Swiss-Prot record, chains A, B:
Similarity-based family: Belongs to the herpesviridae major capsid protein family.
Shown stretch of the complete protein: 290 to 337 of 1345
Subunit structure: Homomultimer. Makes the hexons and eleven out of twelve pentons. Interacts with triplex proteins 1/TRX1 and 2/TRX2; adjacent capsomers are linked together in groups of three by triplexes, heterotrimeric complexes composed of one molecule of TRX1 and two molecules of TRX2. Interacts with scaffold protein; this interaction allows efficient MCP transport to the host nucleus. Interacts with capsid vertex component 2/CVC2. Interacts with the small capsomere-interacting protein/SCP.
Source species of the chain: Human herpesvirus 6B (strain Z29)
Compartments where found: Virion; Host nucleus
Superkingdom of the organism of origin: Viruses
Role description: Self-assembles to form an icosahedral capsid with a T=16 symmetry, about 200 nm in diameter, and consisting of 150 hexons and 12 pentons (total of 162 capsomers). Hexons form the edges and faces of the capsid and are each composed of six MCP molecules. In contrast, one penton is found at each of the 12 vertices. Eleven of the pentons are MCP pentamers, while the last vertex is occupied by the portal complex.
Gene: MCP
Protein name (database record): Major capsid protein
From Swiss-Prot, chain C:
Subcellular localization, as worded in the UniProt entry: Virion; Host nucleus
Functional description taken from the UniProt entry: Self-assembles to form an icosahedral capsid with a T=16 symmetry, about 200 nm in diameter, and consisting of 150 hexons and 12 pentons (total of 162 capsomers). Hexons form the edges and faces of the capsid and are each composed of six MCP molecules. In contrast, one penton is found at each of the 12 vertices. Eleven of the pentons are MCP pentamers, while the last vertex is occupied by the portal complex.
Protein name listed in UniProt: Major capsid protein
Top-level taxonomy: Viruses, Duplodnaviria, Heunggongvirae, Peploviricota, Herviviricetes
Oligomeric form and interacting partners: Homomultimer. Makes the hexons and eleven out of twelve pentons. Interacts with triplex proteins 1/TRX1 and 2/TRX2; adjacent capsomers are linked together in groups of three by triplexes, heterotrimeric complexes composed of one molecule of TRX1 and two molecules of TRX2. Interacts with scaffold protein; this interaction allows efficient MCP transport to the host nucleus. Interacts with capsid vertex component 2/CVC2. Interacts with the small capsomere-interacting protein/SCP.
The family this protein is said to belong to: Belongs to the herpesviridae major capsid protein family.
Superkingdom field: Viruses
Organism encoding this protein: Human herpesvirus 6B (strain Z29) (HHV-6 variant B)
From Swiss-Prot, chain D:
Family, similarity comment: Belongs to the herpesviridae TRX1 protein family.
Principal place of residence: virion
Keyword Zinc-finger among UniProt keywords: no
Subcellular location: Virion; Host nucleus
Identification of the protein by name: Triplex capsid protein 1
Keyword Isomerase in record: no
HAMAP family in the cross-refs: HSV_TRX1 (MF_04018)
One Pfam family cited in the UniProt record for this chain: Herpes_VP19C
GO MF annotations in UniProt: DNA binding
Example GO biological process: viral capsid assembly
Assembly: Interacts with TRX2, MCP and capsid vertex component 2/CVC2.
Assigned keywords, A-Z: Capsid protein, Host nucleus, Virion
Gene name of the encoded protein: TRX1
Annotated organism of origin: Human herpesvirus 6B (strain Z29)
Cellular component annotations (GO), alphabetically ordered: host cell nucleus; viral capsid
Organism lineage string: Viruses, Duplodnaviria, Heunggongvirae, Peploviricota, Herviviricetes
Amino acid sequence: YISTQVVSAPISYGHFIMGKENAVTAIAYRAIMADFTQFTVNAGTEQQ
Amino acid sequence: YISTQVVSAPISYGHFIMGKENAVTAIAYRAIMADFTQFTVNAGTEQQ
Amino acid sequence: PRVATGNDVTAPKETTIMVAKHSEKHPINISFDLSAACLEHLENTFKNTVIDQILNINALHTVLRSLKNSADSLERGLIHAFMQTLLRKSPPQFIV
Amino acid sequence: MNSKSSARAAIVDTVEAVKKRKYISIEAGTLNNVVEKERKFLKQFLSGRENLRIAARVFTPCELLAPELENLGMLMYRFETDVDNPKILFVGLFFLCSNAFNVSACVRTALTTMYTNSMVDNVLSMINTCKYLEDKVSLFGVTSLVSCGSSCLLSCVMQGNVYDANKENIHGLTVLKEIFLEPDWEPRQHSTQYVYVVHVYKEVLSKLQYGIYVVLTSFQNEDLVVDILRQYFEKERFLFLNYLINSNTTLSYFGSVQRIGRCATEDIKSGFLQYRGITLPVIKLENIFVDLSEKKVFV
Amino acid sequence: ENWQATEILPKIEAPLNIFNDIKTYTAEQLFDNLRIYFGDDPSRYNIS
């Protein structure tokens, strides 16, 4: 039941970079929302 | 010393409308930052 | 802002002062009531008779006049509450 | 059938029935004279056929309401007073469960240390100098909207679910875990139980001591519940049979039961209150349709 | 701890995160913070 297989792996890290949004909330409210911008643009629309 | 003169006065209430940003932070962190888009667009620049 | 000091005096340090003012919150309200006979004659003409039309227009003018009086009362409540808060803030003149 | 469509039709029918109860169609001639604010108010024209709960505004000196200005939802008691200036005065269930005898000494002292001041001491002296309890102080309803000004404004619910406004955070009755007990063979039999308040007196050789009990049972019928409470209280009933003859104080029974209202079985949850750090175990009933029936005494 | 962010805010679907029932997990306290309600709690709405 053992065979070598050719797999398509990652080779580097992912990235996560703040925006100005998350920087200001981290400064003033001690906190971070992940996906604050994608979150906000879908906040008021139908597809929440 | 007492006169009656014409003065340019306001006649309506000032407005304020909560942003989508402030709505998201009000749901998340129980807080509103006033002037939040200014703190966003003046953060990483020279003119903080 | 500081001032440069002369001989034999310690120059003071860069004084930075941070304060925070909170918001008082204060509601106001006005009640007015309508009678049940006024509520009955406000919403329908039972038969289309002359007396019933008179009472319908009286009920309508009752509702309108009470709405205008209540809106005026909210304006004057804003007046009085703001004067209340300025008097609670204001210290008198000999102290000032 | 389609199913989804009929479901939307029923939901639209319920929303339109709520609007039919809420607003009123106007058959005034409705001429174009008025300003737009009066125009939109004459188009809407609310009436109070929407809340369907019965409240009462109440003024009480704020020295008596020590945990109850913070913890919304409490039984309240009307104490009439021979003072003309205040003819009635309002009382917390915990404020009266202080000198109730059911409460153990640790909980009693702990609550008292909440309730220690001059006003509350004088009122407890008045309550003790009263002869009986049940018709000098009385049941009044369930707490919502504490204001806490100078003289604190208390709303209080006579009938219906407990809420101020917006029909949000529907509060619940808070019963001290020690004072309540459920006499039935199967506790929490099938479904929603009726919550009662039982006042039971007792005589320790000198004076009468009252006890405040809260029972939860599946029985609706008051004859059945007093028949189960006699079986529960048959010993002390016997002691009062000896007391009530040699006494001369104007009372004629052992205790009395009165219905608070409905509950739900799954809406019973435990917890604890805390005021000034005193952790205090309670059984928090969650959603209560308040329904005061008459007092029914048993001897 | 606030739960109304979970109650309201945008969510990302996840397929077959639990192969097993979460009834046992809720009833026997696998978790550190959990909030469960059967009837629909209307307290999601008082956004202060």
